[PDB]
Nucleic acid binder design. Structure first.
Ligand SMILES: Nc1ccn([C@H]2CC[C@@H](COP(=O)(O)OP(=O)(O)OP(=O)(O)O)O2)c(=O)n1
Ligand SMILES: Nc1ccn([C@H]2CC[C@@H](COP(=O)(O)OP(=O)(O)OP(=O)(O)O)O2)c(=O)n1
Ligand SMILES: OC[C@H]1O[C@@](CO)(O[C@H]2O[C@H](CO)[C@@H](O)[C@H](O)[C@H]2O)[C@@H](O)[C@@H]1O
Ligand SMILES: [Mg+2]
Length: 580
DNA sequence: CCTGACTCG
DNA sequence: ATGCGAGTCAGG
């Protein structure tokens, strides 16, 4: 615990070796336009600390940073790349990212800093970030001496941990997943985040003004029906109004009291007309707080752009998550909410939004992995299982299936293949439990391969203690052999779902890499804006639409080659809303 | 701060 | 006990 280093005040030649562990410290969680508090470099020649003003204004250091031939090893390179972009500097040459390495080895570890990654290899010559910066209102950058040693130790750890981590990834056959998929994806996500999505605040604000009025009307209507005023957004107060004052049936209780979830309220619709109004109120209320007010709070005034952050090392299945703001959960299911999408527009005049989504993606992936003849045959015949299920459930013809019915059927298809109980299905379709049980049985009867697969994958998981995806992503499930019925059950269902969702995640990620290269290749101006799990959203001049209508679907469909074909749907328009 | 509500894939 | 994976919000 005695590490010597150089607290430099000027950049030297030895600090620019062609191989180094680099630390560009951004303390603020949201690194967009966030300050860089310090720099640390560790290479063949030594350990150095540099103040941001010093290094980032140095022509040789900036050149080194942007030199792809000068290899850098880091932890969360995207954070540094984006922070540097906001500082007008280009970062190239990142050959190793410890965050992604740790993430691939075991998502469950929740590695959020170098220290946490270090503990995976019994390395402890580095402190946790939280211990150094403190938490909450106490969070602060320590005195230079302390800060300097911290950043240098983190760089030292990355320097010493690279081989051990690559070694383990190599043994798990995940080294290519890191070097050829996640790392190149990281750079793509950095570009996407920095580019941002332009927002039509004039329109969003007008929508918010009108929403407030409509919300106000529903609010009064609710108080009138309840014969009293109360906080509708308080499940507690609401419970008293519904189950005590109004005497409605209590269909479910949670640890804190009566449940007022949407599923329960919808079931109480026949008893009082105040329940439908409350449901509507909550929807409108969510639109206002989150998609109007909340979104407006994160819009960069000067450019009218929103810059989300795609967490690439968080989900347990390989998916990405989106935060501050979350642009992966913008309304679309209900027309009222869907209009929020009219506020998301191109960043340049005469540009359009282009959206492409994978068709029945996880059913296709499951057909491949399970090798279910019927299911594979269905996709080879280009059938729509969601629509068919809709036709069967609602007892209607193909042309009588509304997009809403299809969505409900969609949830039924995925719920069944992922282990929904008869109780769950019955409650969802408001049908007899026996009926639901028969529907499920009949479902696997139709797809025996899938049934066998799910049974086998659970057994494999119990023996190996983990499951894997097509591209070797991994997830450990230690609870799978648990004595407790509940604990075990959840683990088993994770064994049934993770490989499928995870593989779908592997595919779209590769599609993004392939698409990006194709774009830069054809010198097209079109560029990715967002990824929404199984869909990619781009913007580009209208003149490039024709090319994209072929390129995007193609690249996405050819990302990987399965036993069944991949199909991509796509549309474009003046706003994200119109891209339908 | 945790719950339970909304939103999406 | 009762498909999976996520984030943000107001109220507790
Ligand atoms: N050293 C390696 C080897 C493989 N992979 C990932 C890349 C995606 C997938 C490619 O597997 P292949 O080697 O092409 O086939 P395989 O390993 O035989 O796969 P399978 O177990 O399904 O036969 O695994 C990796 O990340 N690192
Ligand atoms: N209720 C849902 C909806 C989606 N998903 C997962 C698997 C499908 C994936 C992508 O979502 P969708 O595109 O809505 O599903 P899809 O099968 O691709 O249906 P569509 O053909 O309309 O794209 O997310 C899920 O687990 N449960
Ligand atoms: O830079 C993203 C990277 O950092 C982690 C851990 O430090 O998450 C931080 O940043 C996220 C985006 O701003 C926040 O949602 C999160 O709260 C904050 O700790 C990793 O999880 C992530 O991969
Ligand atoms: Mg889809």
């Amino acid at each position: 615990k005695k590490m010597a280093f150089t607290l430099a005040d000027r950049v030297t030649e030895e600090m620019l070796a062609d191989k180094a562990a680099l630390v560009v410290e951004v303390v603020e969680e949201n690194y967009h336009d966030a300050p860089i508090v310090g720099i640390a470099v560790v290479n063949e020649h030594g350990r150095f600390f540099l103040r941001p003003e010093t290094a980032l204004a140095d022509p040789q250091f900036v050149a080194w940073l942007g030199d792809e031939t000068k290899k850098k090893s880091m932890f969360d390179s995207k954070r540094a790349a984006v922070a540097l972009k906001w500082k007008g500097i280009e970062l190239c040459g990142v050959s190793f990212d410890l965050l992604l390495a740790a993430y691939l080895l075991d998502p469950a570890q929740g590695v959020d800093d170098v220290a946490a990654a270090a503990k995976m290899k019994q390395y402890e010559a580095v402190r946790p970030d939280e211990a150094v910066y403190g938490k909450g209102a106490k969070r602060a950058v320590p005195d230079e001496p302390v800060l300097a040693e911290h950043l240098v130790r983190k760089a030292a750890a990355i320097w010493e941990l690279e081989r051990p981590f690559l070694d383990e990834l190599r043994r798990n056959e995940q080294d290519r997943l890191l070097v050829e998929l996640e790392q190149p994806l990281s750079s793509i996500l950095a570009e996407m985040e920095f580019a941002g999505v332009k927002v039509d605040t004039k329109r969003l604000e007008q929508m918010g003004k009108e929403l407030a009025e409509q919300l106000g009307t529903v609010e009064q209507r609710i108080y009138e029906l309840a014969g009293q005023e109360f906080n509708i957004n308080s499940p507690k107060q609401l419970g008293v109004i519904l189950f005590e004052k109004l005497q409605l049936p209590v269909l479910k209780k949670t640890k804190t009291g009566y449940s007022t979830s949407a599923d329960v309220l919808e079931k109480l619709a026949p008893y009082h007309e105040i329940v439908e109004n409350i449901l509507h109120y909550r929807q409108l209320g969510k639109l206002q707080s989150t998609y109007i007010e909340g979104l407006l709070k994160v819009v960069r005034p000067a450019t009218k752009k929103v810059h989300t952050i795609f967490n690439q090392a968080l989900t347990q299945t390989g998916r990405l998550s989106s935060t501050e703001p979350n642009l992966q959960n913008i309304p679309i299911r209900l027309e009222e909410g869907r209009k929020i999408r009219q506020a998301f527009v191109p960043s340049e005049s005469d540009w359009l939004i282009f959206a492409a989504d994978y068709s029945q993606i996880e059913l296709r992936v499951l057909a491949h992995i399970a090798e279910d003849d019927n299911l594979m045959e269905a996709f080879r015949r280009d059938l729509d299982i969601h629509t068919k299920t809709a036709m069967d459930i609602f007892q209607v013809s193909e042309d009588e299936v509304t997009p809403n019915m299809r969505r409900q059927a969609k949830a039924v298809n995925y719920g069944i293949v992922y282990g929904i109980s008869d109780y769950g299905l019955a409650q969802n379709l408001n049908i007899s439990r026996k009926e639901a049980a028969e529907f499920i049985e009949r479902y696997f009867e139709s797809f025996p391969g899938v049934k066998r697969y799910m049974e086998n994958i659970v057994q494999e998981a119990k023996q190996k203690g983990y499951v894997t995806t097509l591209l070797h992503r991994r997830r450990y499930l230690p609870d799978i052999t648990s004595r407790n019925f509940n604990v075990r059950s959840f683990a088993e269902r994770m064994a049934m779902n993770t490989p499928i969702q995870g593989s779908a995640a592997d595919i779209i990620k590769k599609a993004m890499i392939d698409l990006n290269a194709r774009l830069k290749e054809e010198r097209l101006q079109a560029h990715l804006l967002l990824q929404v799990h199984d869909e990619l959203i781009l913007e580009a001049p209208k003149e490039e639409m024709e090319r994209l209508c072929r390129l995007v679907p193609e690249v996405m469909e050819q990302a990987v080659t399965l036993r069944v074909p991949l199909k991509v749907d796509y549309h474009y328009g003046s706003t994200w809303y119109d891209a339908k």
